Structures are given as C-alpha cells and as structure tokens.
C-alpha cells in the first residue's frame, strides 16, 4: 500500500510544482512593482534635489 501511496504522491508533487511556480511568479511581479515604485519616487526626489541646488 505504501508503494501505491508513492505512485500518487508523485501526482500531488506534479501539481504542487505548478502552484509554487505561480506563487513565485506572483512574488516576482510584486517585487518588480515595488522596484518601479522606488525608481519613480527616486526620480521625484532627484528633481527636488536639483531645485534645492538651484536655490
């Protein structure tokens, strides 16, 4: 019976693979969005810095 459980735990793994892939892709997308947010905030801050140096 254990041998037959292994034959099925292989099928569960083949789907957990897709689930973890999707979760990792979601984390990647969130990290990329955060990086873009950081970039845009930096752009605004550096325009501010240029104005500071002019003043």
């Amino acid at each position: 019976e254990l041998m037959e459980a292994e034959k099925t735990k292989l099928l569960i793994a083949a789907q957990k693979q897709k689930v973890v892939e999707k979760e990792a892709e979601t984390e990647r997308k969130k990290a990329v969005i955060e990086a873009e947010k950081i970039a845009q905030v930096a752009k605004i801050r550096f325009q501010q810095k240029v104005m500071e140096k002019e003043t």
Binding site: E1, M3, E4, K7
Partner: protein, 48 residues
Amino acid sequence: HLMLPFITSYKSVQTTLQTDEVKNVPCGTSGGVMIYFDRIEVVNFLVP
C-alpha cells in the same frame, strides 16, 4: 400447454435478454493493492 398429470415436471428457462450481477468482486492490481468492485452485472440471452 398440457403435460402428464403428476409424473412430469416443467420449468421455464428464459430465452430473452436478462441480467444478473455479482457484488464485492476483489481485484488485485499489479501494485499489490486490492480494490473491490461494488457490482459487476452481466446481461445475456440464450437462443431458443
């Protein structure tokens, strides 16, 4: 139909389609696990 009074016994065998089943049939798979078919029905008929 008519037969002899007491020294002849008749029984009617069906010659049309009929069905009958067997329950809880074991089945041992190549993996060594046993699975039990709840019901297996056979439908058969006998020419006249």
